[PDB]
């Protein structure tokens, strides 16, 4: 698809079995989805954002689609305003920013 | 361009007679480049997320160009970690996500 940046890039994702709606965020390094469940361990992340640095946890290898897009990879978890979709899973499903 | 987003997709941009180095961030509503002096009339705005709010100035209807291209927008002020180029001026370049 070719996503326009007029309004909120704001797409739906599936991660356990759940429809979601997340932010497509070239800014962001790395997912950060808001308080869920997930399998497996899961270990220590800080983060940095405008107004300074924060823990979340990571899950890694996890399955979630993307506008349809599967992928599998590392998702963190912790409080965002909103469901973030960062580079790790953009480069997986071939996202580019195009001008 | 196609960018890729293997690597923070960052571009030199020019304002205020200055060239600075940018991130062109789709989750970011509007600009937001560290402390600079911009002319002309501004407004205090709270911005925020990840780690907390900061407070900005909000300078409107300035020039920007951003790898060869001329916009304008408005741009806010402050002490953001990173400048960012936000969807207010990524639309005015043309910039769309692609996958
Ligand atoms: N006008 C304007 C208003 C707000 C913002 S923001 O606060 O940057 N923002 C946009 C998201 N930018 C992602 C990068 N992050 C930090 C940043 C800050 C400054 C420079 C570079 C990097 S982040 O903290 O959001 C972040 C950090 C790490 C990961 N993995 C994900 C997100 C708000 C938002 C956060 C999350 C969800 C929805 C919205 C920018 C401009
Ligand atoms: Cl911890
Ligand atoms: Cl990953």
Redesign the interface.
């Known amino acids: 698809?070719?996503?326009?940046?007029?309004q909120?890039?704001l797409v739906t994702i599936k991660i356990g079995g759940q429809l979601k709606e997340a932010?497509?965020?070239?800014?962001?390094?790395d997912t950060?989805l808001e308080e869920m469940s997930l399998p497996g361990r899961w270990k220590p992340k800080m983060?940095?954002?405008?107004?300074?640095?924060?823990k979340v946890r990571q899950y890694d290898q996890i399955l979630i689609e993307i506008?349809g897009?599967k992928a599998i990879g590392t998702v963190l978890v912790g409080?965002?305003?909103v469901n973030?979709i960062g580079?790790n899973l953009?480069?997986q499903?071939?996202?580019?920013?195009?001008?």
Do not use: E, K, S, Y
Request: aromatic share 8%; hydrophobic share 40%; with cysteine.
């Open positions: 698809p070719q996503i326009t940046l007029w909120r890039p932010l497509l965020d070239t800014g962001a390094d950060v983060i940095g954002g405008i107004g300074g640095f924060i506008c897009h409080p965002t305003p973030i580079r953009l480069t499903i071939g996202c580019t920013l195009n001008f």
